[PDB]
Amino acid sequence: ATSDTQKAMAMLIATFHKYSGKEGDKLTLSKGELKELLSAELGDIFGKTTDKAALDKIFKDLDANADGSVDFQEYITLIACITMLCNE
Amino acid sequence: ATSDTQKAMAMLIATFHKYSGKEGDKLTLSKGELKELLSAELGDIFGKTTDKAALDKIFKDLDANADGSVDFQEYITLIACITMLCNEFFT
Ligand code: NA
Ligand code: NA
Ligand code: NA
Ligand code: NA
């Protein structure tokens, strides 16, 4: 008995860990791997000519401690905003 | 074709909107509907054998504009924090 919410979150955690495990801390997502993740997972928005600095800017707004990575919470905040074109 | 992330997000929004459409504004979640959602969607963690105050507190924290509802961005911040036991809400 696994709910829709449990299934969806498990998928999000699984994708996040696949990319966070490629460099840096195993539990945070480097900027470079966020870029790769967005191209693979949200391809309808982050395509070939997506401005290289569209991510540079928004990645600064999200990386709270300025360590060059986002944790899962910061990551979900971004994905949720993109999907609803939230102000940020 | 739809990625794991697109599908999961669409699922989270669909569940949120199912409960948000039950009362008040169609696009926001009342406190009572949040409790119902959490018990049905994260039943192992929540339920009726839990503490009401747990929800009065978290609800006040999530309701950024103090209008008595939660938007999806605030809701998903909670769900994500729970699945990782994040310090924001876990004292
Ligand atoms: Na990492
Ligand atoms: Na960081
Ligand atoms: Na509502
Ligand atoms: Na609100």
Domains and CATH numbers, chain A: 4-83 (1.10.238.10)
**What does each C-alpha distance from B10 to A52, B7, B15, B58 come to in angstroms?**
26, 5, 9, 24
Q: State whether residue B64 is helix, strand or coil.
A: coil
Angle between helices A72-83 and A4-20 (to 10 degrees): 120
Contact list in B for residue A7 (CB cut-off 8 A) is 8, 11
Residues of A within 8 A of B41 (CB-CB) are 3-6
Chain centroid, CA B3 distance in Å: 23
Rounded to 10°, the helix B31-41/A4-20 angle is 80
Hey, what's the torsion of the CAs at A5, A9, A10, A11, to 10 degrees?
Answer: 110
Of B82, B91, B77, nearest to A78 by C-alpha is B77
A3/B43 CB distance under 8 A: yes
Record the resolution, in angstroms.
1.6
Shortest-distance ligand to the CA of residue B75: 4
